[PDB]
Amino acid sequence: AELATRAIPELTKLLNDEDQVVVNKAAVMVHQLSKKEASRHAIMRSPQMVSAIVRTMQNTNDVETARCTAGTLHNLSHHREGLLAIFKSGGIPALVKMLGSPVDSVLFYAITTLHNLLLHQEGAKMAVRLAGGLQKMVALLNKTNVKFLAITTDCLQILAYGNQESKLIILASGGPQALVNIMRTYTYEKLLWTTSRVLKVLSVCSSNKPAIVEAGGMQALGLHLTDPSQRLVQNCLWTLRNLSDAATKQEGMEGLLGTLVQLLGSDDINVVTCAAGILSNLTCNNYKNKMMVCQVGGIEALVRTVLRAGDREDITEPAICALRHLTSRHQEAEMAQNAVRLHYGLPVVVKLLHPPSHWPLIKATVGLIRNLALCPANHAPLREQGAIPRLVQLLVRAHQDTQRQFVEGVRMEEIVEGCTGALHILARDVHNRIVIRGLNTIPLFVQLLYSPIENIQRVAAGVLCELAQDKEAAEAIEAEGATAPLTELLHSRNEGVATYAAAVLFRMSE
């Protein structure tokens, strides 16, 4: 129409006029035409027009004009041809500069237009990075308009995804603290969701990870684990899990831990899986977290989770590991050991020692049984579940393997050590000692005494020591030629090896 031949060209000329007064006027007019389809297409198809709009926007000093030109670009970004024209007109560098604007209407137009470019315009991410958009966006995270923040945070997510360089710049700009602040301050679901995704992306970066944890990320994300928004909850859980292997030294974790224990009961497999993984890492060598998890009913919840999981190892492995952690080295380890039995967990625990369980799971299960055996009340029931013959079978097969490396990321040396270690504790009970000896294991334990691995030597000497507390067994051990290899262990730097070995010798001769 007359749009292309007269309208657009006239307006684009007016936008370059010296008397900016006639400019603010042209700006207004163009903005209006952009609001209507017909004239919007005429505008986007005119490189001169688009250029005049960009130029004017980043040079004006008249707010009404800055807003109209930015709004114009905003309306154009809705279309493919518009996105390209802005891009080719050098609009990105201009828009980014507009993120320093004191006018809210201008910032909203600029950020949304950039968001559209980042989402659909090829080459946009590089252009924004080069214009220093990451630093500008992070600095804007102190604003309070939640829809504005939701767009800005999403821009950061798009820019940071799979781009280390960008993740480090966000880190250097104080991104972690700014994002965590948002998670603790606002309640707008869309903003919490977009912010959690930025945090998730950063949580896989070895540099951002510690920073997010130090900024209070663990606790902040934990505040939303019960939100009705499933997308929000899941993204928080994913970020939490990524960060969990580096937060075993944070405090004020009571609430997070309490909620995680509750999530173990979820019908959402991904929620339970993530919750088990996070709990397993947070109870790893942290007695306070161990204490709190047991306090809020974690043992029962974990046992139930293992029962429900069946053969699903993505759940049982971390859950069994959490249980292993929880039944060891802390004021409430003994009650935990008892609780596992009280909540009907012994049967399934022992069950996990058998196929289809894979090695990683078997390894964790043996470690758990070893801790459970520290509780005398678990001696008989563990025996009655057939744990001993299976532990012996695992031991014998693994040893034979080391004599003929990582099988599924597990060395058989570890299985030999673990099973012998569980038998060492189980041997505290007289009836278990009878089963153990009846499986003709003494000759094997004696051979393990020659193992070049100190930890294996310790548990081998250990189980023979327990077995030797019965006269008949001590005689049988001596009859197996244990004296020589034991004597050789007397000078070990390992107190356990030296003590157990000496004890067997005193018991054999007494």
Partner: peptide
């Protein structure tokens, strides 16, 4: 038998 860590790195969606 010390406590062990599980290393996760979900940047998008586990699958």
């Amino acid at each position: 038998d010390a406590d062990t860590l599980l290393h996760f790195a979900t940047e998008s969606t586990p699958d």
